[PDB]
């Protein structure tokens, strides 16, 4: 319902839940102030801009999940990520972090998902890595 939010300055618009048809949905787990995710959140923006908005059809879309310790800290990182997120008071944030076995150093992760909701592909950033996700994999009916 009103759980996943499309960004808009002035008022946050709630994105309609069947926005994700025909695109590959990748969950991006991160925590503000974490040092490893500090250099991953710009280069995953790089793939967001270049890949998706080269052709007229949209090919990728990223949902943001925060492990943040403050609601204001979440607001000032959500305003930095150009992809949609989930609200800090939503059920879905602690449902997904509990489902996908991501604890509160392994962070960040990207997990592409399927239309049925289950896990489709996992890759980490613990160390060209992020290129390995193909947008034609999770085409949604």
């Amino acid at each position: 319902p009103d759980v996943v939010k499309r960004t808009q300055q002035g008022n946050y618009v709630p994105v309609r839940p069947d926005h994700f048809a025909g695109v590959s949905v990748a969950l991006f787990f991160a925590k503000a102030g974490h040092s490893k995710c500090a250099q991953i959140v710009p280069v995953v923006r790089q793939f967001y801009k270049t890949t998706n908005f080269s052709g007229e059809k949209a090919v990728i879309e990223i949902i943001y999940v925060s492990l943040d310790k403050d609601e204001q800290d979440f607001e000032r990182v959500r305003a930095l990520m150009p992809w949609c997120s989930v609200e800090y008071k939503s059920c879905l944030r602690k449902k997904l972090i509990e489902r996908y076995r991501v604890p509160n150093t392994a962070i960040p992760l990207l997990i592409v998902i399927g239309p049925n909701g289950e896990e489709a592909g996992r890759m980490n950033f613990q160390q060209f890595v992020l290129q390995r996700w193909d947008y034609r994999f999770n085409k949604w009916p």
Partner: peptide, 12 residues
Amino acid sequence: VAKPLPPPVQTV
């Protein structure tokens, strides 16, 4: 883990 099942044949 539970991988998503592939789409079926388009029945051409």
